[PDB]
């Protein structure tokens, strides 16, 4: 259908407690598949999905080599930003980056990303045209003139229209049995009293993939966009996911309420109820 | 695969 690949960078300075540290995690859709951490003993790019181990030794030399070079690169970025914002070198600061691509069923590049942040605020980001930049403030504008003269956009475009899609298509093929086979949520409804008049009814979605899901409670077919307590989708740990929606209700009315589950891995929207 | 974006801030 539609698939994404994303890389995520974190560089964090830590004055007088070592040189800045650089983490990288790689994602195909919601599956983590690669990792790198500069504080690791002999830092290298490590696999986090079975289907990536398939790549040969040339792959892992280049990947490790890139992440080592990025340790250096983001160490320079940290410094420059200090001077751009006139901030004492005694504090800690973070740079973050995400980039990657989206593909349709034909393999065609749907759209491309490359966004940079400084201390949790936008800094610079490549535009959807893959040709120009948006600089969040006057600091990031320095970077912009440099990157414009340097022609960084051209590199981003060359990557996103090329290697990005070529590799993503390859991982989807090699991991097809897991990446392109959606996992239906295993669902039930629980029952917990509050006093004599009030009970909570909770609607569980478990072991589903991808992360994207909707849960809604309905009193007599009316949406409780208000009175439903909804937790943010959480990871199980085994590469699938978890979610629950709940509502405060008076005793005996249990049957009036109904849980509705939407998920890619279900043939149809699922309705559910507390069992006597 | 990644690609190296060598150009700094």
């Amino acid at each position: 259908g539609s698939h994404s690949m994303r890389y995520f960078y974190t560089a964090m300075s830590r004055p007088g407690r070592g040189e800045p540290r650089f983490i990288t995690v790689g994602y195909v859709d919601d599956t983590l598949f690669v990792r790198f951490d500069s504080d690791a003993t002999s830092p290298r790019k490590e696999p986090r999905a079975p289907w990536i181990e398939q790549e040969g030794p040339e792959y892992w030399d280049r990947e490790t080599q890139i992440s080592k070079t990025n340790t250096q690169t983001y160490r320079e970025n940290l410094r420059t930003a200090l001077r751009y914002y006139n901030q004492s070198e005694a504090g800690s600061h973070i740079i973050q980056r995400m980039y990657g691509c989206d593909v349709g069923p034909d393999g065609r590049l749907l759209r491309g990303y490359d966004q940079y942040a400084y201390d949790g605020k936008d800094y610079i980001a490549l535009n959807e045209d893959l040709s120009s930049w948006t600089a969040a403030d006057t600091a990031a504008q320095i970077t912009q003139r440099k990157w414009e003269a340097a022609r960084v956009a051209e590199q981003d475009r060359a990557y996103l229209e090329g290697l990005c899609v070529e590799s993503l298509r390859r991982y989807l093929e090699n991991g097809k049995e897991t990446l392109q086979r959606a996992d239906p949520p295993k669902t039930h409804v629980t029952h917990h009293p509050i006093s004599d008049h009030e009970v909570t009814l909770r609607c569980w979605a478990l072991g589903f993939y991808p992360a994207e899901i909707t849960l809604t409670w309905q009193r007599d077919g009316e949406d409780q966009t208000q009175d439903t307590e909804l937790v943010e989708t959480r990871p199980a740990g085994d590469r699938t996911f978890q979610k629950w929606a709940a509502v405060v209700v008076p005793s005996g009315e249990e049957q009036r309420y109904t849980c509705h589950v939407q998920h890619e891995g279900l043939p149809k929207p699922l309705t559910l109820r507390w069992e006597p | 695969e990644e690609y190296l974006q060598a150009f700094t801030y």
Epitope: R62, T69, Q72, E76, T80, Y159 | Y3, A6, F7, T8
Partner: T-cell receptor, first 111, second 112 residues
């Protein structure tokens, strides 16, 4: 890693097409050109990636498959007589910009 | 732009020498190169501000560079041998992958 003619001659006030071959270039490797005039440090001329770049002294013409490129001096003068280096600083994503100058092309301009 | 002193240097084989480089003010990155007669320059060492991050090009441990204040750089060559005879070139740049402005080079000749 690049390969270029060891030397090249031309007339003054003539265009000069300095060629470079880079068979094994990354989809994301920049092409860079430097020159070094006699008894002076090297200087940057121009760089590019896929589309053709222009100065002001030089133009850079990258082939459609990017396996080779030409540096173009529009109107060569005596002062242009230098060694011309074609460098791939990023080296397939393994390096950060330190320059591996080649052997270069020695360009003599004749009056 | 970049300056380097001394421009020229004659050394007795065995004595120590220090080569100086003033980079363009505000440049984060500094590069030392060796240029041996007839060849292109050849990466010696790179600094990011004060940090010597890449000393992979240094022929031997005899070669010591520093950049205490992330400004001026000093390349020390101890117990100079004949083979050290070359032009040593200094370059600074706005950041690592940005255009390198070179100084005129220091010209070393080590004699017996």
């Amino acid at each position: 890693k690049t390969t270029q003619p060891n030397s090249m001659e031309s007339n003054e006030e003539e265009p000069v097409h300095l060629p470079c071959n880079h068979s094994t270039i990354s989809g994301t490797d920049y092409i860079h050109w430097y020159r070094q005039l006699p008894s002076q440090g090297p200087e940057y001329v121009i760089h590019g990636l896929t589309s053709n770049v222009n100065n002001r002294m030089a133009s850079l013409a990258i082939a459609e498959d990017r396996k080779s490129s030409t540096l173009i001096l529009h109107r060569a003068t005596l002062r242009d007589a230098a060694v011309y280096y074609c460098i791939l600083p990023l080296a397939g994503g393994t390096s950060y910009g330190k320059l591996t100058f080649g052997q270069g092309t020695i360009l003599t301009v004749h009056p | 732009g970049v300056s380097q002193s001394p421009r020229y240097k004659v050394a007795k084989r065995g004595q120590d020498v220090a080569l100086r480089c003033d980079p363009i003010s505000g440049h984060v990155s500094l590069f030392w190169y060796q240029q041996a007669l007839g060849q292109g320059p050849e990466f010696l060492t790179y600094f990011q501000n004060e940090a010597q991050l890449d000393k992979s090009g240094l022929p031997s441990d005899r070669f010591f560079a520093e950049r205490p204040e992330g400004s001026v750089s000093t390349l020390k060559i101890q117990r100079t041998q004949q083979e050290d005879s070359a032009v040593y070139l200094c370059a600074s740049s706005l950041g690592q992958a940005y255009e390198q402005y070179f100084g005129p080079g220091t010209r070393l000749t080590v004699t017996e």
